Enzyme design. Structure first.
Site, PDB file in Angstrom:
ATOM      1  N   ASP B  89      27.838  -9.043 -11.334  1.00 52.21           N
ATOM      2  CA  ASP B  89      28.973  -8.320 -11.865  1.00 52.21           C
ATOM      3  C   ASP B  89      28.863  -7.153 -12.738  1.00 52.21           C
ATOM      4  O   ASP B  89      29.604  -6.863 -13.777  1.00 52.21           O
ATOM      5  CB  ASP B  89      30.248  -9.164 -12.275  1.00 52.21           C
ATOM      6  N   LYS B  91      29.305  -3.713 -11.773  1.00 45.17           N
ATOM      7  CA  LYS B  91      30.335  -2.663 -12.144  1.00 45.17           C
ATOM      8  C   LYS B  91      29.388  -1.181 -12.030  1.00 45.17           C
ATOM      9  O   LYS B  91      30.078  -0.529 -13.017  1.00 45.17           O
ATOM     10  CB  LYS B  91      31.222  -2.748 -13.045  1.00 45.17           C
ATOM     11  N   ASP B  94      28.807   5.239 -11.938  1.00 43.50           N
ATOM     12  CA  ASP B  94      28.576   6.512 -12.036  1.00 43.50           C
ATOM     13  C   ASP B  94      27.737   7.232 -10.985  1.00 43.50           C
ATOM     14  O   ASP B  94      27.694   6.684  -9.721  1.00 43.50           O
ATOM     15  CB  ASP B  94      27.608   6.494 -13.327  1.00 43.50           C
TER      16      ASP B  94
HETATM   17  N1  LIG Z   1      29.031   8.902 -17.878  1.00 44.20           N
HETATM   18  C1  LIG Z   1      28.470  10.125 -17.677  1.00 44.20           C
HETATM   19  O1  LIG Z   1      28.443  10.511 -18.903  1.00 44.20           O
HETATM   20  C2  LIG Z   1      28.572  10.789 -16.734  1.00 44.20           C
HETATM   21  C3  LIG Z   1      29.766  11.024 -16.097  1.00 44.20           C
HETATM   22  C4  LIG Z   1      30.026  12.011 -14.972  1.00 44.20           C
HETATM   23  O2  LIG Z   1      31.076  12.424 -14.505  1.00 44.20           O
HETATM   24  N2  LIG Z   1      28.725  12.589 -14.521  1.00 44.20           N
HETATM   25  C5  LIG Z   1      27.555  12.361 -15.116  1.00 44.20           C
HETATM   26  O3  LIG Z   1      26.526  12.949 -14.606  1.00 44.20           O
HETATM   27  N3  LIG Z   1      27.503  11.535 -16.051  1.00 44.20           N
HETATM   28  C6  LIG Z   1      26.180  11.322 -16.681  1.00 44.20           C
HETATM   29  O4  LIG Z   1      25.643  12.377 -17.173  1.00 44.20           O
HETATM   30  C7  LIG Z   1      24.179  12.552 -17.110  1.00 44.20           C
HETATM   31  C8  LIG Z   1      23.956  13.740 -16.034  1.00 44.20           C
HETATM   32  O5  LIG Z   1      22.626  13.852 -16.097  1.00 44.20           O
HETATM   33  P1  LIG Z   1      22.162  15.150 -15.415  1.00 44.20           P
HETATM   34  O6  LIG Z   1      22.759  15.405 -14.013  1.00 44.20           O
HETATM   35  O7  LIG Z   1      22.283  16.569 -16.057  1.00 44.20           O
HETATM   36  O8  LIG Z   1      20.552  14.884 -15.110  1.00 44.20           O
HETATM   37  C9  LIG Z   1      23.879  11.233 -16.315  1.00 44.20           C
HETATM   38  O9  LIG Z   1      23.254  10.218 -17.239  1.00 44.20           O
HETATM   39  C10 LIG Z   1      25.244  10.763 -15.940  1.00 44.20           C
HETATM   40  O10 LIG Z   1      25.122   9.285 -15.450  1.00 44.20           O
HETATM   41  N1  LIG Z   2      34.736  -7.535 -11.894  1.00 43.08           N
HETATM   42  C1  LIG Z   2      35.504  -8.464 -11.402  1.00 43.08           C
HETATM   43  O1  LIG Z   2      35.050  -9.541 -10.909  1.00 43.08           O
HETATM   44  C2  LIG Z   2      36.961  -8.559 -12.250  1.00 43.08           C
HETATM   45  C3  LIG Z   2      37.691  -7.865 -11.611  1.00 43.08           C
HETATM   46  C4  LIG Z   2      38.942  -7.776 -12.088  1.00 43.08           C
HETATM   47  O2  LIG Z   2      39.993  -7.047 -11.579  1.00 43.08           O
HETATM   48  N2  LIG Z   2      39.292  -8.866 -12.738  1.00 43.08           N
HETATM   49  C5  LIG Z   2      38.560  -9.798 -13.242  1.00 43.08           C
HETATM   50  O3  LIG Z   2      38.844 -10.637 -13.932  1.00 43.08           O
HETATM   51  N3  LIG Z   2      37.059  -9.534 -13.014  1.00 43.08           N
HETATM   52  C6  LIG Z   2      36.088 -10.552 -13.466  1.00 43.08           C
HETATM   53  O4  LIG Z   2      36.418 -11.865 -13.142  1.00 43.08           O
HETATM   54  C7  LIG Z   2      36.231 -12.749 -14.126  1.00 43.08           C
HETATM   55  C8  LIG Z   2      37.556 -13.508 -14.391  1.00 43.08           C
HETATM   56  O5  LIG Z   2      37.416 -14.598 -15.178  1.00 43.08           O
HETATM   57  P1  LIG Z   2      38.526 -15.368 -15.869  1.00 43.08           P
HETATM   58  O6  LIG Z   2      39.847 -14.414 -16.478  1.00 43.08           O
HETATM   59  O7  LIG Z   2      38.818 -16.406 -14.827  1.00 43.08           O
HETATM   60  O8  LIG Z   2      38.098 -16.100 -16.852  1.00 43.08           O
HETATM   61  C9  LIG Z   2      35.799 -12.128 -15.220  1.00 43.08           C
HETATM   62  O9  LIG Z   2      34.327 -12.105 -15.455  1.00 43.08           O
HETATM   63  C10 LIG Z   2      36.123 -10.592 -15.054  1.00 43.08           C
HETATM   64  O10 LIG Z   2      35.211  -9.723 -15.580  1.00 43.08           O
END
Ligand SMILES: NC(=O)c1cc(=O)[nH]c(=O)n1[C@@H]1O[C@H](COP(=O)(O)O)[C@@H](O)[C@H]1O
Ligand SMILES: NC(=O)c1cc(=O)[nH]c(=O)n1[C@@H]1O[C@H](COP(=O)(O)O)[C@@H](O)[C@H]1O
Ligand code: PRO
Ligand code: PRO
EC number: 2.4.2.10
Lengths: 256, 256
Positions: B89, B91, B94
């Site tokens: 999981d 997630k 980016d």
């Molecule tokens: N989470 C962010 O900062 C993020 C959000 C978002 O909208 N767009 C985005 O490019 N970033 C993050 O910034 C870095 C950009 O790296 P670059 O393209 O300059 O090599 C790269 O590490 C990327 O993951």
């Molecule tokens: N990414 C998911 O599966 C996710 C999406 C979402 O909308 N809601 C959500 O509860 N989960 C993830 O499922 C698990 C729920 O754990 P619990 O509440 O049954 O202990 C827990 O690991 C949590 O992170």
């Protein structure tokens, strides 16, 4: 519009935001290096050489092949020496109970070394409440992802408005945004903008670039986040200096 | 509406979805255990004891205090023995260039052991394109987060529709959803629903629960994801059996 140094003193400023704004003003830098590298030695050599040029170093701890907590101890030494914050781009993005554990625990122990982390707002405000249970006792700050740089981003319209409200309602812990532009009218919040290069273009996987002048000057952001524009250059120090001078002058010109 | 065993044979089925649907039908289980634990020994003891009762084990590798790749080797042995998939999981959330590195590399090497991962759709389709560059050669699958269980979720309306379109347009790699309900009308896609407990309620950090009968029977999902409803019980095997029987009978009754 207030200088970074005056924003550092605002009544409602978060201590992490204040520390950042003060070192931005002192060093004349609003550049965040995106250190998207796989080797600890390269991360630390970049941090040491570019430290004077940057206000912040953004990490992706999960792409280091040789992560250890001792690497992060060495990174903190460099952050203290050169005066920059460490921002782990973790993108926490689930229910509060889960992200609480992801922030404090596991092999990374992110809250032990990261001044700043960020979160997606899609789960609703429990993502912030969970992080804050670990972050507030450790005097940390958080950024919310209000807009994204990539093609097809859904962080628009009411989504962006929800991120701004969530930040403004959790000002004890949330210090600003990842965004493409100024999204909050409250000067206590920082705006950090990725998707930045001096030249026009993008990548093969949906990244889109805008210039420091566009981002800071026209769109009103505070800090540019730059990865490949620096990291892929031969001389990373000169590249960092070009980005620093671009973002700093765009900020000065906007301030007038 | 087709049985899980018949869905496993659909022309456009992904091989990972087919393997899952076949073992769901064989074992009479549509339960995914959310193994939200900090100790490798507890993860492996749960996987061994509950393996016969589950179609899938959802991991959060980043909250294990004692993660190693050898732990994941032992987990794969149990997944093969008891016939369940491993879903990390993670997630991913980016730009494609970043998530590509996060999926293959770092200390976790997630693509080396995870049958399934998931992604948020907020960055646009580059998140899927980046993951697919690593996942398709390794014969892996991905789930897209179309809806969330938590209070204030922004994964609604046009956001959910965008997740369904992104899945349906990337069917080579995307095998289904994290959702609260059936969101795709195409039977080749799996629907996995977290936020499930036998009793009404929630947690202190925005989690909201619905029953297996509600989720599977009325809302038309395929699989329940259950963490604390099992993990906090004294007898985790009996708890897993209660959830399995609930989700399985809700599925049978809907199929008629
Ligand atoms: N989470 C962010 O900062 C993020 C959000 C978002 O909208 N767009 C985005 O490019 N970033 C993050 O910034 C870095 C950009 O790296 P670059 O393209 O300059 O090599 C790269 O590490 C990327 O993951
Ligand atoms: N990414 C998911 O599966 C996710 C999406 C979402 O909308 N809601 C959500 O509860 N989960 C993830 O499922 C698990 C729920 O754990 P619990 O509440 O049954 O202990 C827990 O690991 C949590 O992170
Ligand atoms: O002296 C300084 O640097 C700060 C900046 C604004 C007013 N005081
Ligand atoms: O024999 C089986 O199990 C599968 C189920 C549908 C038709 N063939």
């Amino acid at each position: 519009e207030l200088s970074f140094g005056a924003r550092a003193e605002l009544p409602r400023i978060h201590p992490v935001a204040s520390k950042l704004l003060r070192l931005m003003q002192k060093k004349e830098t609003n550049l965040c290096l995106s250190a998207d590298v796989s080797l600890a030695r390269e991360l630390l050599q970049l941090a040491d050489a570019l430290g004077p040029s940057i206000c912040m170093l953004k990490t992706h701890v999960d792409i280091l092949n040789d992560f250890t907590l001792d690497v992060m101890k060495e990174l903190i030494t460099l952050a203290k020496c050169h005066e920059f914050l460490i921002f782990e781009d973790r993108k926490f993005a689930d229910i509060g109970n889960t992200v609480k554990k992801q922030y404090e625990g596991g092999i990374f122990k992110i809250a032990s070394w990261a001044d700043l982390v960020n979160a997606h707002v899609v789960p609703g405000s429990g993502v912030v409440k969970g992080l804050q249970e670990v972050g507030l006792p450790l005097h940390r700050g958080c950024l919310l992802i209000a807009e994204m740089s990539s093609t097809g981003s859904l962080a628009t319209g009411d989504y962006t408005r929800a991120a701004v409200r969530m930040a403004e309602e959790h000002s004890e812990f949330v210090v600003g945004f990842i965004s493409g532009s100024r999204v909050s009218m409250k000067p206590e919040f920082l705006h950090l903008t990725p998707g930045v290069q001096l030249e026009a273009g993008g990548d093969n996987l949906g990244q889109q670039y805008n210039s420091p002048q566009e981002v800071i000057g026209k769109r009103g952001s505070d800090i540019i986040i730059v990865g490949r524009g620096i990291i892929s250059a031969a001389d990373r120090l000169e590249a960092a200096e070009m980005y620093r001078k671009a973002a700093w002058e765009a900020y000065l010109s906007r301030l007038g």
